[PDB]
Specification:
This protein is an alpha+beta fold. Helix content is 38%, strand content 11%. The strands form two sheets. It has a four-stranded antiparallel beta sheet. A three-stranded antiparallel beta sheet has the order 5-6-7. Helix 3 (103-122) runs antiparallel to helix 5 (172-187) and helix 5 (172-187) packs antiparallel against helix 7 (217-226). The structure holds the ligand [NH3+]CCCOc1cc(-c2cn[nH]c2)ccc1C(=O)Nc1ccccc1. Monomer. Interacts with ZNF622 and PPP1R8.
């Protein structure tokens, strides 16, 4: 169509891996850097507050375990979101293939979850829809959080904290959500499951769940700290980070602080953008710091990705 005309100035489109709604996702290729991206194609004409809440949160959140927003491109009929390439699939699909994971393996995965959410909370937000479908793997087998549709709001019931279902919410509901996630990783089934919703709300409030035989007392203890019906009783992120289970095969707490900065500009990247946009530093160093999430924001971030993979820093 004529909607893809501003898109095709910057991206060489590829295979669709999204068939169902505006949740439709085409693979893409950045023309300048040569780096692989994923394009979410939303049409406004067809829930668009979930698109607006997402974009706003992603513009302000920047983290090694959060799926990066590079470019927002808004024609008359359509909203395009250009996001990081996660070829490794859903953590959901990873679990249901493997038939549950070992404590050693779940920790490797779970420490990346703690890292992302601890930063989300440090930035004033709460995700409100944490589930293994909303955590994807990049090509280096490292996790990236998605779907900021709800933010600082009911997501999926199986993962919803009791106080949230009651209408008594803000970041404690995420700690419970991570406690449901920790169980499914180690068991390969939900701690609270039924046929009807009124039956599933009944099982959450009461809070009694099964403890499979193969679970360690270290796991059993952390699960009961995270799966408390009282959110005041629920373990704090400050105590989660340096928990002894979190530590078990790592002698150091979860590194939660962002290695991906907003203020700091890479010198190799600011200079390579100059020799192509026909300008100088100071004029470019402030132009990148605009963070408009236009073509310049996509080109900078993907160059900063290109440098990190070991390849030489160049645009075409
Ligand atoms: N609606 C879910 C589509 C899954 O694709 C993505 C969605 C988001 C997303 C949606 N909302 N927020 C982030 C971010 C990245 C991807 C992605 O890179 N997927 C992928 C690419 C290549 C191969 C396999 C998977």
């Amino acid at each position: 169509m004529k909607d893809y005309d501003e898109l095709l100035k910057y991206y060489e489109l590829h295979e669709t891996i999204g068939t169902g709604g505006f949740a439709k996702v085409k693979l893409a290729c950045h023309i300048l850097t040569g780096e692989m991206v994923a394009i979410k194609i939303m049409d406004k004409n067809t829930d668009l507050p979930r698109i607006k809440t997402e974009i706003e949160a992603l513009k302000n959140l920047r983290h090694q375990h959060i799926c990066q927003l590079y470019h927002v491109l808004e024609t008359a009929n359509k909203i395009f979101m250009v996001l990081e390439y996660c070829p490794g699939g859903e953590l959901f699909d990873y679990i249901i293939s493997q038939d549950r994971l070992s404590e050693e393996e779940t920790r490797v995965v779970f420490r990346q979850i703690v890292s992302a959410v601890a930063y989300v909370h440090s930035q004033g937000y709460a995700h409100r829809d944490l589930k293994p479908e909303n955590l994807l793997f990049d090509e280096y087998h490292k996790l990236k959080l998605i779907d900021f549709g709800l933010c600082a709001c009911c997501g999926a019931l199986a993962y919803a904290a009791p106080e949230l279902i009651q209408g008594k919410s803000g970041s404690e509901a995420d700690v419970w959500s991570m406690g449901i996630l920790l169980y499914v990783l180690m068991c390969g089934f939900l701690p609270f499951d039924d046929d009807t919703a009124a039956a599933l709300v009944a099982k959450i409030m009461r809070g009694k769940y099964d403890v499979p035989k193969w679970l360690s007392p270290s796991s059993i203890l952390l699960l009961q700290q995270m799966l408390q019906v009282d959110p005041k009783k629920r373990i704090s992120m400050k105590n989660l980070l340096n928990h002894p289970w979190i530590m078990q095969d790592y002698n150091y707490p979860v590194e939660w602080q962002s290695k991906n900065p907003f203020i700091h500009l890479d010198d190799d990247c600011v200079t390579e953008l100059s020799v192509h946009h026909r300008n100088n530093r100071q004029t470019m160093e402030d132009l990148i710091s605009l963070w408009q999430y236009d073509h310049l924001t996509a080109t900078y971030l993907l160059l900063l990705a290109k440098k990190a993979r070991g390849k030489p820093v160049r645009l075409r």
